[model samples]
Target: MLKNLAKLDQTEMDKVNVDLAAAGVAFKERYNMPVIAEAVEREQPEHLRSWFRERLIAHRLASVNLSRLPYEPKLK
Candidate 1:
């Protein structure tokens, strides 16, 4: 796995990088077009219309950590 990872070019490396970046921001604050473009190159979907919409919607939902999951509840 390490070798495979090391052999990847910039485009390949950015696949995970894009996801990581998206994961850090709020769902509404992210720029998911680039990531969707990357997904288009990687995923061979059966339908373009459905797949594009799906990618745009799903990718914008954040592949990274949820910002609201960790917090101090019942605050004053």
Candidate 2:
């Protein structure tokens, strides 16, 4: 037996998407070293941490089964 959760409204989904886009921009900039999008100056350090929390939460539930999703070297 299974249960289905109600889907989020468009606005809620959009918020996640927009935040993900911001994170995507950050990843693209960090990974390629091309500085493609916005300049990541000013050094508001929590930006990285907060985004990571969102990503982890999205990829996991109350707890992450790290055995299935081992940390990747590229993510560092």
Candidate 3:
């Protein structure tokens, strides 16, 4: 299914982006992430995927409510 990777641009990249998010949107999607890669270096996502997975592993431990926090004022 990922065979179409070469055929996608920013507009079409979000379908895969959603997989990494718990439900909706990703840092890449929400922030209009930039991907800069060498065509020669990027051909194999197996290793690249490992690198990406490592960051995701780290990000799993990183969290903040970037969403609306209606209770923030009530906390005190």
TM-score of 2: 0.22
Candidate 2 regions exceeding 4 Å error are 5-23, 26-28, 38-55, 58-76
Q: Tell how far residue 42 is off in model 3, in angstroms.
A: 13
Candidate 1 residue pairs in backbone clash = 23-64
Cα RMSD of all models vs. native, in order, equals: 12.7, 12.6, 12.1
For candidate 3, what is the TM-score? 0.21
Candidate 2, 1-76: lDDT as tens digits = 6776864444445445656455444433333333434444233322344444543435322221122565678955
Candidates arranged by TM-score, highest first: 2, 3, 1
TM-score preference between candidates 1 and 2, better one: 2
lDDT of each: 0.38, 0.41, 0.35
Model 3 bad stretches (over 4 Å): 1-51, 61-68
Clash count (model 2, backbone only):
0
Q: Global lDDT for candidate 3?
A: 0.35
Q: Candidates' TM-scores?
A: 0.19, 0.22, 0.21
Cα shift from native, residue 57, model 3 (Å): 1.9
How do the residues 3-73 of candidate 3 rate in per-residue lDDT, one tens digit apiece?
Answer: 75454344324435543443322222223223533332334332234334543433232222254435556
Better of 1 and 3 by TM-score: 3
